[PDB]
C-alpha cells in the first residue's frame, strides 16, 4: 500500500493543468486522513475522462503527492497535448539491428515478471536453434556480437517488451510496423506467427547470414530514394541498390564494399549527410542472393496465420496488404528493400498518431517524425527503452508516455479496483 503509485492529471491547457494541480493538492492536503492513496489513484485514472493536456505524478504517500502536485502547479513547463484521441491503440514499431547494448535485459528481467516469462519461453527455443543462452546474452557485461547472437537477442527483447505492455499495462497495439528483422517480432505481436515460429525464423535467418559475413557494405544518405536510384542508374552502378527507405528524405544503400564507400565519399563532398553503416552483411541487396534458397528450405515448415492486428508490411509493395508470413515472405523480407516510410505513411493515413518503438534503444523515431511532418500531421514517436536508462519501475514510464500521447489503453490493468472518491471535478472548459 506504501508503494509508489501513478496519479493522472489532465486539462485543456498547461495553465489550466497547473490550476487543476493546485486545487487537487489543496483537496488532498485537507482530506489525506480520509482518502486511501489507491482509491484516489483509481478515481483519477478510471473515474475521469482524460482531457488533451495530460501529466502524472508518481508518489508513495498522500503528502508526497501534494508536494509533486504543487511542484507541477508552481512550474512553467509547456505540456504538449495528446495527438491520439483514445480511440486507437499505439502502433508498435519494431526496428532492426543496431539497438543492442551491454546488459540491456537485466533491469526488465528483475522488475517485469512478464518480460522474464517471455524470455523464459524463448530460452530453450533459441538454445536448440542457435546454440546459446539468450538470458546470458542480454545480461552479459559486454554487448552481444555476431549476427547469429544479435538478431535472436534483439527479437527476444522486442517481443518481451510487447508482451509486458499488453499483459501488465493493458496496452493492446492498434497496429504493428516492422523494419527488416523487426518484422519477426511484428508477426508474433500481430498473431501472424507463434512466438516459437518467429524465433525459428530469426534464428535460422541469422545463422544463414553468418555464411555471408563480410559480404558488402551499407550506407545512410539524407536524400530521397527516388533521387538515390536516379544517381545509381546515371552513374552506371549495378552492384549497389536502395536497401531501406526509412523516411521521405532518408535512404540506406547496400551492395559492394568499394562502390558503397565511393558513393558516400561523393555525397559527403556535395555537403549531403552520408555515412557508412557498420554491418556484417549488406541485407536487402544482391549480397544476400547466395543464401535465399537455403532460407526458403529452412523455413519450409513455418506455419503462418491470418494477422489479428493491422500489420503494415515493409516487405510488400502495398503495406495495407496483409502478409502470409511463410518462408517465401521471410526470403522477400531479407532481399527486398525495406519500405518503412510507406508502411508508416499508410498507418498515419489510416489515422494512427501514436507510435512506440519497442526496442532496446530507438533507431527509427526520427524517421516516424519525418513521415508525420511530410503528411502535415501531429504524431508522437516514443522509445520503449533507451541505452542505459534505469528502469526501477519497469515499463511504467512508457505506459505514462503512451497515456500522455493519447493512445487507447485498458486502464483496468494498472488500476484493477478501488472506490470512486469525491475529488474535485474541474469545469468542462
UniProtKB/Swiss-Prot annotation:
Active-site residue numbers: 180
Locations listed in the record: Cell membrane
Domain of life: Bacteria
Leader sequence segment: none
Location of the region described as Acyltransferase in the Swiss-Prot/TrEMBL record: 90-409
Function as written in the Swiss-Prot or TrEMBL entry: Catalyzes the elongation of long-chain fatty acyl-CoA with 3 or 4 methylmalonyl-CoA (not malonyl-CoA) as the elongating agent to form tri- or tetramethylated-branched fatty acids known as mycocerosyl lipids.
Subunit comment: Homodimer whose monomers probably have a head to tail arrangement.
Protein name (database record): Mycocerosic acid synthase
Gene behind this protein: mas
Amino acid at each position: 500500500h506504501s508503494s509508489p503509485r501513478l496519479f493522472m492529471l489532465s486539462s485543456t491547457s498547461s495553465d489550466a493543468l497547473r490550476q487543476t494541480a493546485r486545487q487537487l493538492a489543496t483537496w488532498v492536503e485537507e482530506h489525506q486522513d480520509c482518502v486511501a492513496a489507491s482509491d484516489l489513484a483509481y478515481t483519477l485514472a478510471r473515474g475521469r475522462a482524460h482531457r488533451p493536456v495530460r501529466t502524472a505524478v508518481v508518489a508513495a504517500n498522500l503528502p508526497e503527492l501534494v508536494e509533486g502536485l504543487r511542484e507541477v502547479a508552481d512550474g512553467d513547463a509547456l505540456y504538449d497535448a495528446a495527438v491520439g484521441h483514445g480511440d486507437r491503440g499505439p502502433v508498435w514499431v519494431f526496428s532492426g539491428q543496431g539497438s543492442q547494448w551491454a546488459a540491456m535485459g537485466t533491469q526488465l528481467l528483475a522488475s517485469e515478471p512478464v518480460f522474464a516469462a517471455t524470455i523464459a519461453k524463448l530460452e530453450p527455443v533459441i538454445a536448440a536453434e542457435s546454440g546459446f543462452s539468450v538470458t546470458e546474452a542480454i545480461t552479459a557485461q559486454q554487448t552481444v556480437t555476431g549476427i547469429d547472437k544479435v538478431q535472436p537477442a534483439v527479437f527476444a527483447v522486442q517481443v518481451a517488451l510487447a508482451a509486458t505492455m499488453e499483459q501488465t499495462y493493458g496496452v493492446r497495439p492498434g497496429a504493428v510496423v516492422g523494419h527488416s528483422m523487426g518484422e519477426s517480432a511484428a508477426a508474433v505481436v500481430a498473431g501472424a506467427l507463434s512466438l516459437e515460429d518467429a524465433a525459428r525464423v530469426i534464428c535460422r535467418r541469422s545463422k544463414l547470414m553468418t555464411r555471408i559475413a563480410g559480404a558488402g557494405a551499407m550506407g545512410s544518405v539524407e536524400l530521397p530514394a527516388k533521387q538515390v536510384n536516379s544517381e545509381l542508374m546515371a552513374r552506371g552502378i549495378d552492384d549497389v541498390v536502395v536497401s531501406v527507405v526509412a523516411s521521405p528524405q532518408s535512404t540506406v544503400i547496400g551492395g559492394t564494399s568499394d562502390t558503397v564507400r565511393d558513393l558516400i565519399a561523393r555525397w559527403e563532398q556535395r555537403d549531403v549527410m552520408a555515412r557508412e553503416v557498420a554491418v556484417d552483411v549488406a541485407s536487402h541487396s544482391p549480397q544476400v542472393d547466395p543464401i535465399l534458397d537455403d532460407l526458403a528450405a529452412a523455413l519450409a515448415d513455418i506455419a503462418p496465420m491470418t494477422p489479428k492486428v493491422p500489420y503494415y508490411s515493409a516487405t510488400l509493395f502495398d503495406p495495407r496488404e496483409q502478409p502470409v508470413c511463410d518462408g517465401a515472405y521471410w526470403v522477400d523480407n531479407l532481399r527486398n528493400t525495406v519500405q518503412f516510410a510507406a508502411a508508416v505513411q499508410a498507418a498515419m493515413e489510416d489515422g494512427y498518431r501514436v507510435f512506440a518503438e519497442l526496442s532496446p534503444h530507438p533507431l527509427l523515431t526520427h524517421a516516424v517524425e519525418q513521415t508525420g511532418r511530410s503528411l502535415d500531421m501531429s504524431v508522437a514517436a516514443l522509445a520503449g527503452m533507451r541505452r542505459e536508462q534505469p528502469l526501477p519501475h519497469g515499463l511504467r514510464g512508457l505506459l505514462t508516455e503512451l497515456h500522455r500521447a493519447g493512445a487507447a489503453l485498458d486502464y483496468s490493468a494498472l488500476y484493477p479496483a478501488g472506490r470512486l472518491v469525491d475529488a474535485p471535478l474541474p469545469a468542462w472548459g
